[PDB]
Amino acid sequence: ALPLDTTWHRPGWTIGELEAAKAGRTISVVLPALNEEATIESVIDSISPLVDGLVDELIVLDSGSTDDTEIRAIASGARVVSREQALPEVPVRPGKGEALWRSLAATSGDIVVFIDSDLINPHPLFVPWLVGPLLTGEGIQLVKSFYRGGRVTELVARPLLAALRPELGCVLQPLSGEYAASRELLTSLPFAPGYGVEIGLLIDTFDRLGLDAIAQVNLGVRAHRNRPLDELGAMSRQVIATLLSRCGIPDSGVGLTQFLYTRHTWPVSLVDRPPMKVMR
Amino acid sequence: ALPLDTTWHRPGWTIGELEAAKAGRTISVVLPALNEEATIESVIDSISPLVDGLVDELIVLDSGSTDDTEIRAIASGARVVSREQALPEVPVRPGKGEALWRSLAATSGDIVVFIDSDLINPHPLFVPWLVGPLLTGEGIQLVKSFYRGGRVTELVARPLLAALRPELGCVLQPLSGEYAASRELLTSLPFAPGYGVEIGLLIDTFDRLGLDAIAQVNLGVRAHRNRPLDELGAMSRQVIATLLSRCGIPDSGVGLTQFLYTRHTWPVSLVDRPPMKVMR
Ligand SMILES: O=c1ccn([C@@H]2O[C@H](COP(=O)(O)OP(=O)(O)O[C@H]3O[C@H](CO)[C@@H](O)[C@H](O)[C@H]3O)[C@@H](O)[C@H]2O)c(=O)[nH]1
Ligand SMILES: O=c1ccn([C@@H]2O[C@H](COP(=O)(O)OP(=O)(O)O[C@H]3O[C@H](CO)[C@@H](O)[C@H](O)[C@H]3O)[C@@H](O)[C@H]2O)c(=O)[nH]1
Ligand SMILES: [Cl-]
Ligand SMILES: [Cl-]
Ligand SMILES: [Mn+2]
Ligand SMILES: [Mn+2]
C-alpha cells in the first residue's frame, strides 16, 4: 500500500531458502565499532553462526576504540579490521561514515550488510531479514530496517524529508544503522562524513534509482545506547549538512555551538568521501 | 562577549525604576491559551499585581479552549479575548501564530509581552526581566528569554540556524514562548502559522534590523507541559517550513506522516498572516 516495498510481518523465508537463492552471490557483514565493549560480543554471537553458510564474511570495523572492543571481539572469533588496515594508502578521518566507507575495501561480498554494535540483544534473524529482498526480489539494491524513541529521526530526518524530498516520506527509519545493499550501488556512491552517512545513501540511492530499488523490513524492537541530548544535537547538525547538500542547498559549514553556562563548538563536515570505485 | 546583548545574571532594575523609564510608553501582556485550565490561574496571578503599574494591560487570548480555561482566567480577574472577538472581520484559522497575530488588534501597548500559559510556577519577575532592555537600552526592539530539554530547539531549530543563518547561533532559546517586542516591529512583520511563529519573528527581525536590535535575558528555570514525540514532530515540521521559507528555500508543503502501525498525516501551512499594519 506504500510506493515502497515494505515487509510488515516476520519475513517468510528460511535460512536454507535464502542461501539457495544466492546463486553465486556472496554476503559480507560489517560491524562498525567505537568503544562498544559492553555489547560487541552479543552482536557478533548473534551472527557468527551464519558464517560459511548464508554469510561468507563477517568483520568488526574498529573505529579507534580505546576500551576492550578489539580483544573481546577477537575472543568472539571475529576478524577485527582497523580503519588503517582497511585502506592504508589514505589517512584516517574521524566519524562513522569514514568507517563504513573504508569497510568497502576490507570486504569482497556482492552484498554488504551493516549492523550497529551497540545493540542490546539483537535477534539472530536480523541479517536474514535484511538480505531477503535483495536475494529474492528483483530491482532491489538497498534495504533499510524499521522498528518500534528516534528523536533525531522523528524530529529532524523525517520532517526534513517531508519538506525537501516528500517522496521518501514513507521510509519509516531513514537513519537506521541496520541495512544491506549491493556492492555495485555502494562503491558507486559517495560517503557522507560522520553521522551523515545514512541519510546521504538514502537520498543518493533514490535520486539515482528511484523508489523501486529500495525496500524496508521490520526487525521488531530496537534497543541501543541512549546518548545525551548535546551529542544528538551535534549528530543532527551533520544530518542537516548532508541532507541540505544532497538537496542543492548551500550549508554554512558553521558547527553547532552549545552553552552548558559555557561555550563549546562541535565539528561539522562538508566533505564527502568519493565513490570507492575511483580507488581501484 | 556575544554579538548579541545577553543578560546572564538576575537583572538589576527594580519595578519602580522600570516604571519610571517608560516615559509615556505603555505595556501590554498577552497570554495565549489552548486548554490550559491546570496552569492558567497561577500564570495570571504571577503578573496581575503589575497591572495599573508597570503593566497597563493584561489579556488571555483564548485559542478555542473547550476545558475551563476561560471561566478560571475570569475568576482570576483577567480579560479573556477569543480569536473571534480579537478581529471579527477575519475568519479564524487554527494554530498559535494566528492567536498571537490576532492579539495585536486586541491590545494597544507600545510594547507587547508574550508569556505561555502552560508554565508551572512562573516567577513574578518574568515580565520585568523581559521589558528591561526595551525600556533602558537603545536600539532594542525584540527580547527573547533563555533558561535551563528543548528537544525541538536543540535538535531542530538551533542546528538549522547554524546551517542557514549562522549569525543567530548565539540565540540560546530561539523558540522561547516568553518574549517582548515593540508594537512598531510586530505590526510590521508577517506572522507565520501554528508553531512557526517564533522562528519567523526571530529571522525577520534579524534580516530587517540586525543583531543590535535583539536582546536575550535569563529567566532561570522553565517547566511546562511535556508533549508526546508525535506532537513535537508535527511542530518541528512547521518550524522547518517557516525557517526554510525565510531562508529562500522552497518547501514541499507536504505534511509529516507517522505510522503508529497505522498512517496519520499532520497539517503544515505555508501561509503567513500579513503585517497587522495592512488591516488599519
Ligand atoms: O565515529 C564513529 C561513531 C560511531 N560508530 C559506530 O556506529 C554505530 C552507530 O553509532 P551511534 O553512536 O550508536 O549512533 P546513534 O545515536 O544510534 O544514531 C542513529 O542515527 C545515526 C545517523 O544516521 C546512524 O548513523 C546510527 O547508526 C543510528 O543508530 C555504533 O555501533 C558505533 O559504535 C563508529 O564506528 N564510529
Ligand atoms: O493553537 C494553539 C497552540 C498553542 N497555544 C498556546 O501556546 C503556548 C505554547 O504552546 P505549547 O503547546 O505549550 O508549545 P511548546 O511545545 O512548549 O513549544 C515551544 O516551541 C514553540 C515553537 O516556537 C513555541 O511556539 C512555544 O511557545 C514553545 O514553548 C501555550 O500556552 C498554548 O496554550 C495556543 O494558544 N494556540
Ligand atoms: Cl556510475
Ligand atoms: Cl515597513
Ligand atoms: Mn546507537
Ligand atoms: Mn509548552
Curated annotation (Swiss-Prot), chains A, B:
Report the catalytic activity. an NDP-alpha-D-glucose + (2R)-3-phosphoglycerate = (2R)-2-O-(alpha-D-glucopyranosyl)-3-phospho-glycerate + a ribonucleoside 5'-diphosphate + H(+); (2R)-3-phosphoglycerate + UDP-alpha-D-glucose = (2R)-2-O-(alpha-D-glucopyranosyl)-3-phospho-glycerate + UDP + H(+)
Q: Which residues bind (2R)-3-phosphoglycerate?
A: G150, R151, V152, T153, N226
Question: How are cofactors bound according to the entry's free-text note?
Answer: Requires divalent cations for activity. Mg(2+) gives the maximal activity, but the enzyme can also use Ca(2+), Mn(2+), Fe(2+) or Co(2+) ions, but not Zn(2+) or Cu(2+) ions.
Which Gene Ontology molecular function entries are recorded, alphabetically?
A: hexosyltransferase activity; magnesium ion binding; protein homodimerization activity
* Gene3D superfamilies from the UniProt entry: Spore Coat Polysaccharide Biosynthesis Protein SpsA, Chain A
Q: Which residues bind Mn(2+)?
A: D118, H224
Which keywords accompany this UniProt record? Calcium, Cobalt, Glycosyltransferase, Iron, Magnesium, Manganese, Metal-binding, Transferase
Q: Which domain of life is it from?
A: Bacteria
The residues listed in the UniProt record as binding UDP-alpha-D-glucose, with positions renumbered to this chain, are: 32-36, 63, 96, 116-117, 195-198, 222-227
Secretion signal: which residues?
none
Q: What is its EC number?
A: 2.4.1.266
Which Pfam families does this entry report, sorted A to Z?
A: Glycos_transf_2
Ligand binding ((2R)-2-O-(alpha-D-glucopyranosyl)-3-phospho-glycerate): K96, G150, R151, V152, T153, R222
Cofactor(s) listed in the protein's UniProt record: Mg(2+); Ca(2+); Mn(2+); Fe(2+)
The protein's matches in InterPro entries, at most eight in alphabetical order, are given as: Glyco_trans_2-like, Glycosyltransferase_2, Nucleotide-diphossugar_trans
Q: Name one GO biological process term.
A: UDP-alpha-D-glucose metabolic process
Has the keyword Metal-binding been applied to this entry? yes
Give the record's subunit note: Homodimer.
Record's miscellaneous remark: Was identified as a high-confidence drug target. The glucosyltransferase GpgS does not possess a putative nucleophile residue that could result in the formation of a glycosyl-enzyme covalent intermediate. Therefore, it is expected that the reaction would proceed through a front-side substrate-assisted SNi-type mechanism where the breaking of the glucosidic bond is stabilized by the interaction of the acceptor hydrogen atom O3 of the acceptor 3-PGA with the beta-phosphate of the nucleotide sugar.
Instruction: Give a short account of what the protein does.
Output: Involved in the biosynthesis of 6-O-methylglucose lipopolysaccarides (MGLPs). Catalyzes the transfer of the glucose moiety from UDP-alpha-D-glucose (UDP-Glc) to the position 2 of 3-phospho-D-glycerate (3-PGA) to form glucosyl-3-phosphoglycerate (GPG).
Q: Which NCBIfam families match?
A: PRK13915.1
The entry sums up its family as follows: Belongs to the glycosyltransferase 2 family.
Protein name, per record = Glucosyl-3-phosphoglycerate synthase
Q: Which organism is this entry from?
A: Mycobacterium tuberculosis (strain ATCC 25618 / H37Rv)
